[PDB]
Amino acid sequence: IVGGYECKPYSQPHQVSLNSGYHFCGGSLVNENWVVSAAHCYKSRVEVRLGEHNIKVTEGSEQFISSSRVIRHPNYSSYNIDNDIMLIKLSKPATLNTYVQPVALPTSCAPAGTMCTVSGWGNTMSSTADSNKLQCLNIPILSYSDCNNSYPGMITNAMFCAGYLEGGKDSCQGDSGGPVVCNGELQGVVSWGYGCAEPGNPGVYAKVCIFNDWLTSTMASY
Numbered sequence: 001i002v003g004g005y006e007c008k009p010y011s012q013p014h015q016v017s018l019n020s021g022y023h024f025c026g027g028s029l030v031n032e033n034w035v036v037s038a039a040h041c042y043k044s045r046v047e048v049r050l051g052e053h054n055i056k057v058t059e060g061s062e063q064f065i066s067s068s069r070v071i072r073h074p075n076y077s078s079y080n081i082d083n084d085i086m087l088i089k090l091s092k093p094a095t096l097n098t099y100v101q102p103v104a105l106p107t108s109c110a111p112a113g114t115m116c117t118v119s120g121w122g123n124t125m126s127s128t129a130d131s132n133k134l135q136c137l138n139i140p141i142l143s144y145s146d147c148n149n150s151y152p153g154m155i156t157n158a159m160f161c162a163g164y165l166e167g168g169k170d171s172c173q174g175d176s177g178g179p180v181v182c183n184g185e186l187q188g189v190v191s192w193g194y195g196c197a198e199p200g201n202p203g204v205y206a207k208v209c210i211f212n213d214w215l216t217s218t219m220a221s222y
């Protein structure tokens with residue numbers, strides 16, 4: 001996260017770290033058994049770490065749970081990073097408590113201008129901000145016009161832009177798969193962008209609100 005502030009510890013209890021030796025992507029707990037992340041973060045098996053604040057120090061609030069199933073959206077395309085969403089089933093249910101709580105799936109698509117929070121342990125590109133401690137950032141959802149203008153012909157129905165066209169504040173590598181929460185609901189998943197915090201290059205996010213059918217059906221299928 002570039003240009004944000006350190007999240008208050010456990011203020012984003014749905015935030016999870018996907019670990020394969022080291023943290024490599026974020027994700028969001030949507031219920032005791034399932035985590036939503038980005039398809040470009042796909043790995044056959046991953047260890048989901050919940051209840052984290054500082055990912056390099058044991059705080060006593062963590063739960064490390066291995067994945068049971070990793071399911072990429074059927075239409076995910078590595079050629080253009082389209083339909084960048086994936087579900088991870090936990091091999092054992094997460095224990096919900098003060099440090100671990102699920103985030104609600106959207107009841108509808110958030111309109112442009114809606115203020116959201118994006119968080120993660122990715123590149124901060126600053127000498128002050130320690131990426132081992134969860135970083136937070138408030139970003140507004142941009143209109144399709146603004147999004148298409150920045151990335152001509154690259155924005156599909158499954159993508160939306162959020163951030164600032166002036167740059168300076170953005171999600172970055174390592175934040176991939178993480179949450180974009182607006183009005184208490186998961187509206188986006190950190191997906192792609194040109195660099196981080198560059199003017200004219202806002203972050204691109206998977207549009208969760210158009211995947212409710214797939215999400216609901218898959219979470220009921222085994």
Ligand SMILES: NCCCc1ccccc1
Nearest residue numbers: 171172173191192193203
């Ligand atoms: N806001 C940038 C998010 C990081 C990213 C960029 C390009 C491809 C994958 C992730």
Ligand SMILES: [Ca+2]
Nearest residue numbers: 054057058059
């Ligand atoms: Ca920790």
